[PDB]
Amino acid sequence: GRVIRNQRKGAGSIFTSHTRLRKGAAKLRTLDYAERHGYIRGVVKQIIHDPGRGAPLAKVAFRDPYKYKLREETFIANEGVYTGQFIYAGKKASLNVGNILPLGACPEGTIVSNVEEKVGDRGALGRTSGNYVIIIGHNPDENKTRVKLPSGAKKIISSDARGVIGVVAGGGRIDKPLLKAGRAFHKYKVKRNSWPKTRGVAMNPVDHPHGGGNHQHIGKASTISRGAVSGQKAGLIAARRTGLLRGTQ
Amino acid sequence: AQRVTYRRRNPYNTRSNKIKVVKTPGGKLVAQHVKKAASRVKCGDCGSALAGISTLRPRQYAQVSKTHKTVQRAYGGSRCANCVKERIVRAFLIEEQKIVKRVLKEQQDKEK
Amino acid sequence: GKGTPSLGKRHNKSHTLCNRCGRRSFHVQKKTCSSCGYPAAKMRSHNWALKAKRRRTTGTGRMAYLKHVTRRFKNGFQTGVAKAQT
Amino acid sequence: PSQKSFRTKQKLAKAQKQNRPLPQWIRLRTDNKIRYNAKRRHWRRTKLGI
RNA sequence: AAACUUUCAACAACGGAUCUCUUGGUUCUCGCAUCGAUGAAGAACGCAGCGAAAUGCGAUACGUAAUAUGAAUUGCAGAUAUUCGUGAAUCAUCGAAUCUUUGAACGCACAUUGCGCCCUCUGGUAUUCCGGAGGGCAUGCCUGUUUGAGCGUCGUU
RNA sequence: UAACGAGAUUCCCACUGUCCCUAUCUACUAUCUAGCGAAACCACAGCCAAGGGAACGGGCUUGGCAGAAUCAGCGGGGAAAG
RNA sequence: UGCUGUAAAGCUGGGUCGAACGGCCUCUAGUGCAGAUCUUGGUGGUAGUAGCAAAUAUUCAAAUGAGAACUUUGAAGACUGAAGUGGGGAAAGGUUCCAUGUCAACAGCAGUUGGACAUGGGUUAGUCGAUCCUAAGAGAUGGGGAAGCUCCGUUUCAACGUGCUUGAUUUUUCAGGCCAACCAUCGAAAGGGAAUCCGGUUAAAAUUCCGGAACUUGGAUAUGGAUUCUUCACGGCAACGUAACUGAAUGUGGAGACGUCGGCGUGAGCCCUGGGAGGAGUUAUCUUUUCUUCUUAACAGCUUAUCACCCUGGAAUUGGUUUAUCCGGAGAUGGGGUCUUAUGGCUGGAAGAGCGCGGUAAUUUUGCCGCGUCCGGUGCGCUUACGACGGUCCUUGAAAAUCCACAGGAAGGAAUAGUUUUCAUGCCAAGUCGUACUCAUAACCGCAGCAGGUCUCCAAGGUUAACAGCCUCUAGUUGAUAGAAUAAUGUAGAUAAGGGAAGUCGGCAAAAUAGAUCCGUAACUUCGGGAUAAGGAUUGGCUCUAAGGAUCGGUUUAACGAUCAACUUAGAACUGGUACGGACAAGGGGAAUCUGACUGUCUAAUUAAAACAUAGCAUUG
RNA sequence: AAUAGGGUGAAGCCAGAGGAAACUCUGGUGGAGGCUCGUAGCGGUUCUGACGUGCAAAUCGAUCGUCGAAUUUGGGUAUAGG
RNA sequence: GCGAGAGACCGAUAGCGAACAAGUACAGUGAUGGAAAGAUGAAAAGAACUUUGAAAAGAGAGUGAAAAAGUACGUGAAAUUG
């Protein structure tokens, strides 16, 4: 048969991300002496749209502690941050909207975003519009903190890992219908080539495992083993269950 | 009416291939290639067009006298009038308040 | 539509002249000669195309230097000049 | 085109110079076998290779 | 009976069989060991009094030198070319040279005759800018030289 | 299921040479001339009826017949060509 | 010409020809042709047959020539009709360009002609492009894979400057002071980007040559001016002004630099047009007439602007204000000012040029002379540029080279003299490559001079909603073998009495409708549509009527006078073989069923659909 | 880089009317939309027209879909035979 | 590759693809594909001259042993043709 649409993506020829119009990688500051021991103050200069992202980004200017130069950082904008606001980042920063604090300095119930998975990786968790991380509790003896992620998962992170206080701006975007195919075309015009999707059942058996037949039908179970091989994993991969989700999980 | 042609090998209506139509002393109507319109020098603080500064395409600033490219004030050809005034007042009041926050902490180092 | 009308849209050379072999087999976008292999150090040649070897091999050009090794070898690679007889 | 490279223009010069008829005094040489230039080229008929 | 069609013969056509050649090929045997960074094989562009090709050659361009030989070259032309001779012609021979732009290709680059830097000399009032001439600046590795680096480390104050 | 459709289908009004049933008109061809000048195809060829026969004959057998050289149309046949 | 042999074949008479060949005993083999839709070559019938019929269209005369339907010239008739059959280009071609000669082949007739053939000539750049920058991307290096051709990686586990800048030194040594996040390279003739215009000139080149007039960059460098004894200038409340009027390291900004629409304003060019000064055409009659010249470059100076901003001031009886709804105690209206110079004006350039006339020199290179070339108006006009605005996105709409300004204050500077080349003037240089011509119903690709394909700039008058269609000005063409006839059958186009789908699988095809104004407009509906639903009336010409404005001018009767100006709407009378969106242009409509929601997409070359996609829904990791 | 001329008339805004209020109604303005008629463009429905040894190895004519966006397109660049 | 000597080999549709300006002309974007094509005569003596013709050409003539050898060149079969 033929190479299916799943596998052609690994080569990444026409499946790379469209990044001409992107405004920068959204990251926290590099963890330095100022953030580890005290606090550093920066000012929000711009709040700009980043193509391909639902969340706006904020460009915040800090002074360099070691040489006479200005450093511009690209943070994910939390809702309520304004241009000219002072952002305080470090261990001793106060509980104000927009400040970047280590997780151990935040009491339980603190809503935080752009949280570091590992100390100094500059942000992994809760970066999309409207999402955030809830701090569940602390384990000071092991220097660990329990948090709740946007997926509903509870995670244990080093208490020295950093995060930004507040909710990521731009939430509620999904509340509006797209209506037109052109709206989705323009949405993916600045992300990557993943739209539109042809149903595998409407192709021929060479093109897809679902293709062929004198009627459009899959023919076998669409739940595929986790141990299946590339070229087979089309459908519901390692599906624990199927059908309409009824009741709570 | 007489019609015109481009004067260069470029046959396409691009931004750098703009023409104006001018009548010559020969009574003919010919195309004269025009250069791109200059953009105004803008404030680095508020983004408004700065007054008193000539509007030129960037290389042309090198070949003109300095009085055309600046204004006699602090931050003359760089910041706006209101933004320089606002910088000055902010600098004075905050530094004045810097003394207050310092003296207020030396008086509490004897009574507290 | 795919024949005569489409054949009218051929004005973009895929290949241009090669500096090594001068053949117009130099892929413009690939920056490689399909004939001579430029800019690779070795020459492109295959034993499944022996006629291609015939077309470009020793003796098909001038041999401006290998011409004369036999004649210099035959005299034992002399150094000096011939002396006129008395 | 009007805009052409030096490498192109030098090849077009050789093609013009090779597009001469046989010089007629060549037929007078002893044991001459060439009756005409058999490598003539028309611009419209056969295209070069640039 | 003409014409027409068909058959036959003669001559003329068409065409290139047949015969006969052959500086080619094919095969066997015998003998030899010699490409290139001292720049090969190959490519592009040029070169002649009058040349397009093939052959030859490289701005010293169908060749310069030397050696041998000994009066040509030749289609025409033409010596301020040559003849009992340092002397015509000749890839006859060849030991000295010339050998454009390239190419393993070597300053970087090349769908560009694009863009540098170093040394000496020279011209423009010039160490610096602009012009010209000549000579240089690639990579891996070896031996050696010089200059260095590391509380890796020895001695001493 | 409103709206949409060079999508499939039925009916009605209008309109009509679709038809009853055909007729007339125009230009360009076809036609004749000067010049120019291909191609498919071709075992040999070319009038019928019956017979027998590879059971549907241009040829064989038995009959009908049969008089040079030719032009425009035509689509029965060559179980025409591809 | 015969003879022999059953035969395969052998010999021989005559002709032709011109250099080798045979008999017999044997050896040897790439040894015998009618086929194989055999191979290569050559040739027929077909057959002087099919045919040389798209793109409206040609005709008379002269010249040349042996020869003219086809060449040249003249006269006429036409077409393309500014979305061209016009004028240029990118790609592609490569000498097709121009002149002379020229017709053997080619131009499916011809040929005196040609994009053919032959010989020559022709492409001139500091300013036009390349070159430089970076884009998606490509790709060396330290390295890491792979037996290897090579693969990965682009600052990556790297000791990564052939660094600079000064005071110099003439000791060709130095002394050192700063920095080295990022930095190989290639990659755009449409992106970014230093700088040129007018008139003239060739057979063929020109933003390239000639003439005049400019500009940029790099370099050198003197004079004037400017500035200093209050050393690195003054003025202005301010926005800010200037002929100038120190400023290292380092830092910060701006320009470069950016989407798409909608209406409005202004300019430029075009269109329309009024006097005056010329030229041509018509003139039986009419027409103070119809057509035409009346132009002004880059560059320099002065002036010139919406926005924005400054000073004054303190607002309800809220005011100002756009076609479009915003602004104001975070300071409106009012009054007064500052800036950008896009754009216009005046002047220089510059009338000397160019243009239109009149008079002359002469085989005459080429002219010489005189007159004029002036002042206006108009606009829902077209094209285009710009400006201030409004809308739009689950879309927010490149980079780099490069240039400038500012912050900063290192360092250096005067009094008998010092500094500075961001004010004026002056001096030198700008290399290399492309440059002719076609850009297509004949210069490219489709085997070819093929009705195909191929990216883009300029765009007149009338009718009109219109860049549609039709006619016309400029320009360019009049090219497509021709002549004679006009049967059948065609191809393309028209018409038809009465009937009106009875034809047919099926109304296939054709016909009917059609512009604009007024009236009127059903089910169903997601309330948005359906809708031009359906269905009626009108429309010419002429002569009038009515409505709709601009600019100025003064105790609020300017409620009036003066001047000027554009086409819109509505109405009336008369009129004609009752015609009038009179050509062109231009919906057929209605009631339902199946199906896909819709816009969209695909089988290039037999399938456009109910198929695919979509938003929406749901599941999985 | 390119895309005649029309139709419709979404938000927002102005004025007036009714109402005790909540609000409603009317006349304008405005210029939205993968809306619509329709050029160029892009496409290719039907005549199952022409041609079908063609102008053409896919064309010609009329008719037709769409025509401001999921638009058309040049050039550069990337993806290469199971 | 270089330098030689040979053959019961082939004899221009054969023999290497190429006896020749052969890896040439030419095709294809490219990798690649790739021909045809030898013979006047001992010697150009390659037909001076005249004449018809616009010319190519023809007719005389001339060269040659031969023009029944005229660069369409020795010999010149068949198909096909007058």
Ligand SMILES: NC[C@@H]1O[C@H](O[C@H]2[C@@H](O)[C@H](O[C@@H]3[C@@H](O)[C@H](N)C[C@H](N)[C@H]3O[C@H]3O[C@H](CO)[C@@H](O)[C@H](O)[C@H]3N)O[C@@H]2CO)[C@H](N)[C@@H](O)[C@@H]1O
């Ligand atoms: N780019 C770096 C990272 O590589 C990793 O990618 C994976 C690959 O390096 C390798 O994964 C292989 C892959 O080579 C191969 N071509 C396909 C195969 N399905 C993968 O296998 C992977 O997924 C399967 C699922 O069944 C797991 O069982 C297995 O543990 C995991 N290695 O192992 C890694 C996972 O353990 C990250 N998963 C990926 O998200 C990221 O790109």
Ligand SMILES: NC[C@@H]1O[C@H](O[C@H]2[C@@H](O)[C@H](O[C@@H]3[C@@H](O)[C@H](N)C[C@H](N)[C@H]3O[C@H]3O[C@H](CO)[C@@H](O)[C@H](O)[C@H]3N)O[C@@H]2CO)[C@H](N)[C@@H](O)[C@@H]1O
């Ligand atoms: N419009 C006033 C003047 O023009 C400027 O803007 C000019 C253009 O940038 C602007 O263009 C449009 C405009 O139609 C309308 N306001 C919408 C759009 N925001 C504007 O576009 C602009 O903004 C977008 C932001 O998305 C930028 O990405 C885009 O590059 C820029 N051109 O409209 C102006 C056309 O002349 C500024 N708006 C303003 O500061 C200035 O005073």
Ligand SMILES: NC[C@@H]1O[C@H](O[C@H]2[C@@H](O)[C@H](O[C@@H]3[C@@H](O)[C@H](N)C[C@H](N)[C@H]3O[C@H]3O[C@H](CO)[C@@H](O)[C@H](O)[C@H]3N)O[C@@H]2CO)[C@H](N)[C@@H](O)[C@@H]1O
């Ligand atoms: N009547 C038709 C139309 O209305 C107009 O015409 C108007 C009148 O002339 C006409 O009526 C008049 C009648 O009053 C009086 N007798 C005068 C006139 N002769 C009549 O009219 C008659 O005259 C000629 C005859 O062919 C036509 O033009 C006209 O239509 C006809 N009705 O009817 C109209 C109103 O009364 C315009 N002429 C035009 O739009 C068109 O003709």
Ligand SMILES: [Mg+2]
């Ligand atoms: Mg497969």
Ligand SMILES: [Mg+2]
């Ligand atoms: Mg991360």
Ligand SMILES: [Mg+2]
């Ligand atoms: Mg896709």
Ligand SMILES: [Mg+2]
């Ligand atoms: Mg899917």
Ligand SMILES: [Mg+2]
């Ligand atoms: Mg979906």
Ligand SMILES: [Mg+2]
């Ligand atoms: Mg799908």
Ligand SMILES: [Mg+2]
């Ligand atoms: Mg399928």
Ligand SMILES: [Mg+2]
């Ligand atoms: Mg399968």
Ligand SMILES: [Mg+2]
């Ligand atoms: Mg399966």
Ligand SMILES: [Mg+2]
């Ligand atoms: Mg299936």
Ligand SMILES: [Mg+2]
């Ligand atoms: Mg299904």
Ligand SMILES: [Mg+2]
């Ligand atoms: Mg299904």
Ligand SMILES: [Mg+2]
């Ligand atoms: Mg031009």
